[PDB]
Amino acid sequence: TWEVLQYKDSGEPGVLEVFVTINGKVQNITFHIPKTIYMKFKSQTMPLQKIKNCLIEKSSASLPNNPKTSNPAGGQLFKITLPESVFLEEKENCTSIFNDENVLGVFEGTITPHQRAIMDLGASVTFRSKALGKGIQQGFEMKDLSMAENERYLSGFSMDIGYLLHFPEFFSLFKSWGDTITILVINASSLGQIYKQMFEKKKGKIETYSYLVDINFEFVYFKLYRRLSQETTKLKEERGFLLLLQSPFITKLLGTIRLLNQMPIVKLSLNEVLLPQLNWQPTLLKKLVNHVLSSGSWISHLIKLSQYSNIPICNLRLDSMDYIIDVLYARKLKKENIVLWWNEKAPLPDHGGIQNDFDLNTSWIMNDSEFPKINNSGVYDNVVLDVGVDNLTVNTILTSEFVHDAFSNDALNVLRGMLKEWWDEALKENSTADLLVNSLASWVQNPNAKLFDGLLRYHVHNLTKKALLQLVNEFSALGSTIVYADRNQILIKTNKYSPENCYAYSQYMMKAVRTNPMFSYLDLNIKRYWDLLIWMDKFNFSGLACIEIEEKENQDYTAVSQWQLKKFLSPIYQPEFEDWMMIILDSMLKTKQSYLKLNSVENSLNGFSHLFSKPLMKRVKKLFKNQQEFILDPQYEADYVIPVLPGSHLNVKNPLLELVKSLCHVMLLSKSTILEIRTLRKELLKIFELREFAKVAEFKDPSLSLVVPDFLCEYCFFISDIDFCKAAPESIFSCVRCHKAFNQVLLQEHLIQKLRSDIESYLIQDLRCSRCHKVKRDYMSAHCPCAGAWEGTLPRESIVQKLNVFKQVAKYYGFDILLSCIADL
Ligand SMILES: [Zn+2]
Ligand SMILES: [Zn+2]
């Protein structure tokens, strides 16, 4: 039995080397792993050319269901096990088996012997030869003798370690058994004090992880650029150990020093480190000290992950969780009879070479990532429950030929069983299983992970939408009304009137929802209770809310006012807007309380504008007179300047008109006191010299919408949309739950992706006739057989306006890359 530390292919095909730990110290052995590919060659009779030394067998494995490939045709799939050397020497010639007629495509031609060994053999490798010397002087062959033993423990770790770091001239080194520190081109005292202070800060962690790595050390701050080779050589000839590497240029540092290829190295890339241009010494000292004194915890976590995942030490990374999922799923499918369609250095599934061709169905199924939502405006005097749904994707996965857009159900069932055992193991005190299940969704979304497929993503998204609509239907079965719906938030109207009487009601509804077999894995949390709500949009609402209802005590009520509409008013009328909004909300609360104390119409609110109509009329008259007097004054023109904000498209002149229009449109959401509001609106419009049904007296949305779907926060594995026009700042740049700043170039890149996808979608549209709405079914024709000329499904003005709003968004923030993206058109 041997614990493998690293797998690595050589420069010779079919040859591999491993830094392995024999009973004594570490040792390197030469490995030989052959190649295996999948072929669909000829229909049933083939030019065998069997004189070439290879093993050929016909199998009945499962093929990927390419939507373009709707024709089964021949199905005589073949298995080919063939050494890489003969593969390379026959690739030069043309008249060979791999290149002939009726070659449909190779399915497993990109799996290097590195991957084949790392998944087929694992870290726990041994010998059962029963020629050891002949196999140790040469490379010992595997395909005849190979088996994996148990790996519940890797080895008792007592070895030296190495440190190599770079912070973009900040080359760094440290030795576990050394007692000196030198930094390449006040500092020493700061180094000592920071070491001591964080030593008492993390006494406990240091004591726990001392057995992995073990103290004060000397300080030095070092023509000089050649000493890296000298240090690496002296470390090589002084000790045989593992090296911790941390830099944004891992490959460059590997290529600069040739001695690095001779030792087993673990990479710990945490890149994107920068300097503050001033006072860099303490921040770099903090970085170095936390790195060196948290390397123990880092290596402990790596050891746990490796000794659980049956993968060697050097093949794992702290953030590379997708790789473990890929290797274990591929191993399970290899034990099955399904082709892996594994791919490298390309974010596409391997379909035999067909995948590189453009196709309409595929291009439609990649770019349809928008998630619909429900919003029913209105004013509610009833109590409303704000609930949150969690772990929806995992529940959707676990719960639930003719169709060409169907994903292979065999793989779906395999991954469902995988996730079921994952859930069971995570239940029984397993942090690794819980973290992996959490990262499953991010693995599903991310195409950078290998073994990716767009069909599976589309299938999962469709099933998630169906599950959400089923949940809405279930919530609608009892007495309830859906105000807003989303992947994360659901607002439900409760028939009752007092929040204190909805304790058992809400608890019973949550219990009944949870007990349903379809929704057994949902986590439901209630956040807020709404006494009185004025809801018109996600970013536009106001009402009185209580956090959680208490017993024997009146609840603490706090009013909220979130109105992005207020940002489009003149800087002189916004105080009036907020004051009048507070006044009307107070009046609505007063009238509802009076109605309740008394006992499509609801007398809870009917008759609320009677309290403030005359003061409002007088205030509007005074505002109109003051605006008339002080609008053309030069020094008084500061407060009448109309603000400009991205997404704005309305050109208006008189700010008081928009003030009263907003103040009336917020009222017009009642849907039960419409006549009173209309009379008040007419009376207000009589102050101006306008009429009831004029176009200038019609309210519109002063802002457009530009939403980026499914932005991922790695710090939470959290999925939500983001509105670049309507959402306020300090929320575009940070996650909703965690307050961690987003990376800006990712935002700009996703915006560019959205714009390019929009352009392609417009260019790939279909043509529809004018009178009848039948689709154009001829590659060339003047017009419809009946009367009428063709028109496109996507109009030009829509995409023109979208490009305009992209310009506005790119101009408001500092986005140079998006500006250059537009300028190249
Ligand atoms: Zn977050
Ligand atoms: Zn027609």
UniProtKB/Swiss-Prot annotation:
The keyword DNA-binding applies. It is found in: Nucleus. GO terms for molecular function: 4 iron, 4 sulfur cluster binding; DNA binding; DNA-directed DNA polymerase activity; double-stranded DNA binding; mRNA binding; nucleotide binding; single-stranded DNA 3'-5' DNA exonuclease activity; single-stranded DNA binding. A motif (CysB motif) lies at residues 769-786. Zn(2+) binds at C713, C716, C735, C738. GO terms for biological process: base-excision repair; base-excision repair, gap-filling; DNA replication proofreading; DNA-templated DNA replication; double-strand break repair; double-strand break repair via nonhomologous end joining; error-prone translesion synthesis; gene conversion. [4Fe-4S] cluster binds at C769, C772, C784, C786. Keywords: 4Fe-4S, DNA replication, DNA-binding, DNA-directed DNA polymerase, Hydrolase, Iron, Iron-sulfur, Metal-binding, Nucleotidyltransferase, Nucleus, Transferase, Zinc, Zinc-finger. Belongs to the DNA polymerase type-B family. Catalytic component of the DNA polymerase epsilon complex which participates in chromosomal DNA replication. Required during synthesis of the leading DNA strands at the replication fork, binds at/or near replication origins and moves along DNA with the replication fork. Has 3'-5' proofreading exonuclease activity that corrects errors arising during DNA replication. In eukaryotes there are five DNA polymerases: alpha, beta, gamma, delta, and epsilon which are responsible for different reactions of DNA synthesis. Present with 1970 molecules/cell in log phase SD medium. DNA polymerase epsilon is a heterotetramer consisting of POL2, DPB2, DPB3 and DPB4. This is DNA polymerase epsilon catalytic subunit A. It comes from Saccharomyces cerevisiae (strain ATCC 204508 / S288c) (Baker's yeast). The lineage of its organism: Eukaryota, Fungi, Dikarya, Ascomycota, Saccharomycotina.
